[PDB]
């Protein structure tokens, strides 16, 4: 299915978890987008948002203040999504005029380019990098797979099959105790290994890398 269930489930887990373990962060989570907010953004960008993503917006329109929900990375508002998508679209146009190896993991899952108009950012680094939804996949890719892209992602990672599965995998990390407070700033650590603090992109990259490797033995 599309992944709407996983979006609704994950947002309840996350809505809960913030009010309990970090009230200050709960407060940053915005009111729902209206259907017209979404329609206008879809019109401005000339694209259909996937169902789980539209579902996510009708629960929270990003974060407002605003230190980031996803272990420091900020959930983007719909206006930020539009402003940033156009920003990346300008980059892609200038790369046409003037035309580090761009790669993908899995190979051929994501287009090997610095910028693509159909890559819609949903989370931000506040430093040029994003998690977002890929509406123009490679040949071994899947439509509306979730990817990392930006300044420092010459290699691009497919981190989930849809927005719902991503939001859920994050909700699972919170429920599994893989977190530390610096109340204050939220950062990742693997609890079962008593491990150090880690940057969340590096965790998502490793897990993509791992999942690819474990799946490689299978074909038919």
**Interface ranges with its own copies (CB under 8 A):** 92-93, 95-97, 99, 107-108, 111, 113, 115-118, 136-140, 143
Q: Cα–Cα distances in Å, from 97 out to 92, 94, 111, 218? A: 9, 5, 19, 42
Residue 100, Cβ density class (10 Å: 0-12 exposed, 13-18 middle, ≥19 buried): exposed
Provide long-range contacts, Cβ within 8 A and 24+ apart, for 193-202: 200/70, 200/71, 200/72, 200/73, 201/73, 201/125, 201/129, 201/148
- Smallest gap, in angstroms, from Cβ of residue 159 to its own copies? 19
- Rounded Cα distance between 156 and 212, Å, is 13
Tokens 């009111």, residue located: 31
- Smallest gap, in angstroms, from Cβ of residue 113 to its own copies? 5
Among residues 34 and 140, whose Cβ is nearest to its own copies? 140
- Rounded Cα distance between 104 and 18, Å, is 34
Among residues 125 and 134, whose Cβ is nearest to its own copies? 134
Give the number of other CB atoms < 10 A from CB of residue 152.
12
- Rounded Cα distance between 70 and 59, Å, is 16
- Smallest gap, in angstroms, from Cβ of residue 89 to its own copies? 9
Among residues 99 and 194, whose Cβ is nearest to its own copies? 99
Residue 208's φ and ψ, nearest 5 degrees, are -65, -50
Among residues 52 and 137, whose Cβ is nearest to its own copies? 137
Among residues 59 and 158, whose Cβ is nearest to its own copies? 158
- Smallest gap, in angstroms, from Cβ of residue 139 to its own copies? 5
- Smallest gap, in angstroms, from Cβ of residue 94 to its own copies? 10
Among residues 77 and 111, whose Cβ is nearest to its own copies? 111
- Smallest gap, in angstroms, from Cβ of residue 51 to its own copies? 13
- Smallest gap, in angstroms, from Cβ of residue 97 to its own copies? 6
Among residues 39 and 94, whose Cβ is nearest to its own copies? 94
């Amino acid at each position: 299915n599309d992944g709407v269930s996983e979006t609704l489930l994950a947002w309840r887990h996350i809505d809960f978890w913030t009010s309990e373990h970090n009230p200050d962060l709960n407060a940053t989570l915005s009111d729902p987008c209206t259907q017209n907010d979404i329609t206008h953004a879809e019109e401005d960008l000339e694209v259909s948002f996937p169902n789980p993503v539209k579902a996510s917006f009708k629960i929270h329109d990003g974060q407002e203040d605003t230190s980031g929900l996803f272990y420091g990375f900020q959930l983007m508002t719909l206006d930020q999504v539009v402003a940033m998508t156009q920003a990346w679209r300008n980059v892609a146009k200038n790369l046409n005029k003037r035309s580090p190896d761009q790669k993908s993991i899995p190979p051929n899952a994501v287009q090997p380019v610095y910028a693509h108009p159909a890559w819609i950012p949903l989370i931000t680094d506040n430093a040029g990098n994003h998690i977002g939804v890929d509406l123009a996949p490679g040949p071994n890719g899947k439509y509306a797979q979730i990817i990392t892209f930006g300044r420092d992602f010459d290699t691009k990672f497919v981190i989930a099959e849809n927005w719902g599965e991503f939001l859920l995998s994050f909700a699972n990390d919170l429920e599994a105790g893989n977190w530390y407070l610096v109340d204050g700033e939220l950062v990742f650590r693997d609890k079962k290994s008593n491990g150090p603090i880690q940057d969340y992109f590096e965790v998502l990259k490793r897990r993509t890398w791992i999942k690819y490797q474990l799946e490689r033995p299978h074909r038919d």
